[PDB]
Symmetry: D2
Subunit: 384 residues, 4 copies
Amino acid sequence: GFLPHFQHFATQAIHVGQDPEQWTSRAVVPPISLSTTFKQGGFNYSRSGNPTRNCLEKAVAALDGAKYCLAFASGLAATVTITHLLKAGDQIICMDDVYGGTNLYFRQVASEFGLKISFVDCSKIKLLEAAITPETKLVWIETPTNPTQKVIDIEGCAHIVHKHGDIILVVDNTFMSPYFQRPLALGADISMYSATKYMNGHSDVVMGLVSVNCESLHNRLRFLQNSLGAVPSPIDCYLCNRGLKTLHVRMEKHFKNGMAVAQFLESNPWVEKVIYPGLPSHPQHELVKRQCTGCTGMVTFYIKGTLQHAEIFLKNLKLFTLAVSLGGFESLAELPAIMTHASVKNDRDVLGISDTLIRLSVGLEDEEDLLEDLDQALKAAHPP
Amino acid sequence: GFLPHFQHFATQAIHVGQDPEQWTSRAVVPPISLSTTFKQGSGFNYSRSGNPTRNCLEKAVAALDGAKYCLAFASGLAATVTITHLLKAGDQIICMDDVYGGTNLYFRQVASEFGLKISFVDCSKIKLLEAAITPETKLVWIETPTNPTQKVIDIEGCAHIVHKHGDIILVVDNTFMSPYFQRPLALGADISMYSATKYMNGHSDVVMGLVSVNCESLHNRLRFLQNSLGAVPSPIDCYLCNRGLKTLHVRMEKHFKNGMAVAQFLESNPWVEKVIYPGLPSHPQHELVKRQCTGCTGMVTFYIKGTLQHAEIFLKNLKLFTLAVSLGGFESLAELPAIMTHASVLKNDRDVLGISDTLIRLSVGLEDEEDLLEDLDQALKAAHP
Amino acid sequence: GFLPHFQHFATQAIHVGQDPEQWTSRAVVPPISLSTTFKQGAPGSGFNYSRSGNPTRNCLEKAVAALDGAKYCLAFASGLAATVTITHLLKAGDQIICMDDVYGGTNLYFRQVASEFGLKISFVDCSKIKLLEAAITPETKLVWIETPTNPTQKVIDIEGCAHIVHKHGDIILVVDNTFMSPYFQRPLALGADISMYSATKYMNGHSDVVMGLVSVNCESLHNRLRFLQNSLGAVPSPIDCYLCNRGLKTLHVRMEKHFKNGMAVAQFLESNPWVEKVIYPGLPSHPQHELVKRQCTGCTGMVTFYIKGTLQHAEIFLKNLKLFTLAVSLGGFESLAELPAIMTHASDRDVLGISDTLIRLSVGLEDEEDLLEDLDQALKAAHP
Amino acid sequence: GFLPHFQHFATQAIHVGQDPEQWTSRAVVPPISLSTTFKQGSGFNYSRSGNPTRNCLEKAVAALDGAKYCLAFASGLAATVTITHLLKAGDQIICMDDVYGGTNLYFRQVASEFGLKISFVDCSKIKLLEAAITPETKLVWIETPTNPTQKVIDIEGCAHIVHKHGDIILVVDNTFMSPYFQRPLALGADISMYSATKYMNGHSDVVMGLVSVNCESLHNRLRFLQNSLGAVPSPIDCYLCNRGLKTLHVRMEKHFKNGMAVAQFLESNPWVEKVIYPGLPSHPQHELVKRQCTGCTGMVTFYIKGTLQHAEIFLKNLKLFTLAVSLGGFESLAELPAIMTHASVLKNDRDVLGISDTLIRLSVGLEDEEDLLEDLDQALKAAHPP
Ligand SMILES: *[C@H](N[C@@H](CCSC)C(=O)O)c1c(COP(=O)(O)O)cnc(C)c1O
Ligand code: MET
């Protein structure tokens, strides 16, 4: 009962921006144009625009259902560039469980330059409307959140935010990818990604992506892409565009493997709790089906016992690799308390990042091998 | 009578950061590590925070600058934006009046929107600079020689004045000279910054910024902002820039020889109004250039005789110089700053700075000297038959 | 009723050769080592020269070997370079038996080049038991077969061929496995001595690497091939090795999609009133369909068919394709179409069945319904 | 008193093949086209047969060789193997007696298995070359200077002798000199061949071969074998090599200056038995070098005094020179050919050629001269303390 799959997604991922008539050679794959500058006697300077990045941006825009897309050197760089749309005296409302890097940037950096940052549980209408002031210019939401996967009603959020006037709604769509969730179709003003994760999907490109429909909002972002210069390499653009060509077949396998991993973990006697949007046990599972076409490979769970049991489990994994990041073809496992949020503690506790919290990025390996790896590692821990 | 060349520069450019013992394979050239993440269970954890190929580049650039530390960024502008994030609302920035257009545009139209106060002053003179310094001043941004009129600033004199007033950061954008010819950190600057897009990489195929620093606390704050703002370069671009660094010494020497020859030809040409080249005795700060530099680059600025259209006729008659923006590559480029690069500086400021309708900026490349002179010769005769 | 899918294929494609412990950084993705040379003889046996061996190529070769069910694999600069290197295993006076309808480049090399250096070349229809064994002489040292053939997709009983060849002693059987990929067919498990690929096609799968691959089990045969890899030097770039190894990580989900799209296209074409004949191994109408099911786990996206009418109708159809792109090569994510008479086999040849109405499709990963519509409207343009 | 430097070399290395008008974007640097195939209707059809980035490189190298055509290959050895496929069973190949070990091994152990007869001749005395030519001779393969003893061959004299015997191809492996210092095609050679892995790319990060030719029929035969045998380079490698070419002139001049200083330091060093450097007056063909070359490279060969023990102590004590094979990069390398790069040459031919236990080959890089001399000084003193 998910939202129907987006039409022409695979076709557009392979063809949009890739027109061979763009090149004198009529190459079916766009060349990698490294050149920093161009003869005048189109393009003038690589930072302002270059063929390989433009092809990628055009492709991503179609996959987001957007008119425009802007590529950046990283997801955080995309976040920083979006925030430069504002001015001193503006207010930002940010979700209380956003990605750690987003939280850190708003709290310790953006707040230094006349921007007021308010962290709100945007799952509650009373708290979001109470936080909106005439100074509110930006609402930053992520869904599902990293790493506890709280889910936000995007269209409900947009309705609340957009009756208050001149407010931009950003959805960090990193966990879902545009194959499973289209925030712009749901009322968001900006669909933002860490392409470092699923979009590229091959664990070899750091990149951010920002898709938009509004004309003035696009021009303001395009100005900051060139003027701040947090631009991606044309080679990274090529590699990310290459990764996009398999996004549909990758994400479907992430869905299949992720669901199987989540169901196996939830029935495992050494697992205390599982958080996976595809499971009926997820508190927002019905909302997930209303606003998504499927689910990703990110599976979050709590192991029974203590930190010692989480450590024994993690150290006995042989296929899941103990590492940060996510969204690649390879399965990863991570303990957020020691690996990402090691500096955070009191905010950990309200957000549930405990000693037994484990986040899995379920990859594309054979399902039976992933389940077996989890099975033997959990038996090694065998907590009470 | 230039400063003696920096000792061991070529040796360090080829070897620093490149130690084969870093790799299990003992590869003589560092591998390109694209991996975004690293197995744990010590060293690296996430590519944006640090990765082998970038760290090798940063170590090499730091040595070339005489620096303890270096940070690589996605572009020169990204390096500028990251440096400016060191400050806070209420701080003042002093910027050189003749600066790269993108630097001027960023400070004037973006940074000023976030509680930062911006003052543009001619930092070649002390009366105007000290009049601009306020208790809120936290950053002084200079370029020398400036882009594009190539005004030269006494770096050590500027640093001494800036460092009397307490906790103020002096950045020298050293893009035009490269660390082979000028070491701002040896002259008292706090930061030596580059658009590595130009000479550092030198091959017109990498957009990148570089920031070298000595102060420990300044490095820790910049390193925090490199990871937290995420304006990081591709590991492949890092490899390509580090590859370009291996020929920086022989490239810059050829830029110097070709640049000097072009400047002398232009200065004796009957169709050239004025030449601005730090290597010529006619440059107003030539003696200062010899005291703070070991040589000069291929950037040649001159004013053509006649009007705006004579400058255009000259530019469109070139057959070896290519009409394009950017600089510092192996290929010779020509450009009219008023309409092409510093078109983002307001017109009133460009007239005060001498960025007129006849000012032309050359990036003299590594081609045969005779071919470059002949291209300039025939193009100038076409503009004035 | 196909062969069961090869176990652990997806897991091995992602993990074999990719061990993070190989690198001091413990990178989860192998770095690209461009270095031509390596420091020797330091205190405390390693690589010495890139052509002889380098980390990125060695990682690729180990991955491909596992995917082929092989002990060893050697990578080359192209599929043809792999073919030429294999032929250098022989000496003047040896005989080569080659299939009468191999890939044109294979045919051209044997006929016009190899025959000039003391090698006797015999072209035999290896689909016939008595024709193959009658051609074998005491001088026969190499039997080269391709299945299915390019482009008419004739299918050869690999195990039957190997059994017949290996009764006669010291003869090498090579199977060019380009059309099927190791995901759908394992010639070494069926008795072949060498499984050879143009990785330019499915193996890389992203139309941006030219490469050959050679997998083998026999120890002496591997040492002889390894000597020729270094001594002839037709080696691939380490960057290309990285790109091909990257493409391997999605081979299973790509090939599964090629199978599903290819089956739908082939089935659609066979019921189309303007198609004379369809040749697709997955269809029951294929003359060796039961044999395909016995020696393969599935089928690829290569669909061969004959259009009704004349050469002009074939041209009108190809001209009207909007999604399929008119170009040579195959095995990429994008759909391609080709008329072998004008494009590849131009320099009768009806004896092999490449007529004016022969069209070869490489069905890509686009949305199935978009591909079927493209074929439908293009076929209606011909014969209106 | 060398030949005058070739006119427009630097200009052409930077501009030939790099015309921005080739690309719709007008990029000043040619894009890297990885695409294996091309949409059909007027140029490319399949990457192995030809692709934009490789074609740009080939045009650039051709101009630098003073040639009409150039063909790029996956390695220097692949270029050698492709050239040899021009022949047929029954043909004879004459090869210089001192060549790169891999060249020697390929002809001796592989090409000889396919009806080709291989003769190793000291072509430095072109009297022995004329005695070796038979009606079956179709290919004469020389290197000058040779790897690693750096014997020098009169290319023009060699070409005159080879070409009066009719239809014989003369190849000069120009790897050690690069086209900046030597143009074999201008001296009568039919083919100028390189391991671009060395000086041409110059950055120790590309394995590649290059083949430049003027003859029309010879080019068509080579172009056919480039496509039909498929030993082609990656378009990315082509881009990297073309990038390296843009500094070839300034690199080679520094190799010349550093190589001369290293060679002079070694020759006056009391612990060095003999130095072989084409730029030194002591080189037996030094005057011939000045008549067919515009300068000299960084390859310096010498014999250390003493025994194998001293050669090992010297090599293990170097701090800047890296003990490794290959050459022509920005970094200085040192190597013992008898055990490392010419261990594949039979021991008997090794002693006859002077590839002994005390023979050391240096690839002098672009580091600061005084640092290079210091490293050699202390390492030689480690083998022979004062
Ligand atoms: C390259 N010779 C190198 C290779 C080292 S192998 C132990 C050396 O150090 O001597 C070379 C070649 C071969 O070209 P490739 O690109 O295939 O390596 C050919 N000709 C000469 C003169 C060489 O030096
Ligand atoms: C530890 S810095 C990188 C964090 C990474 N994006 C993650 O959430 O796993």
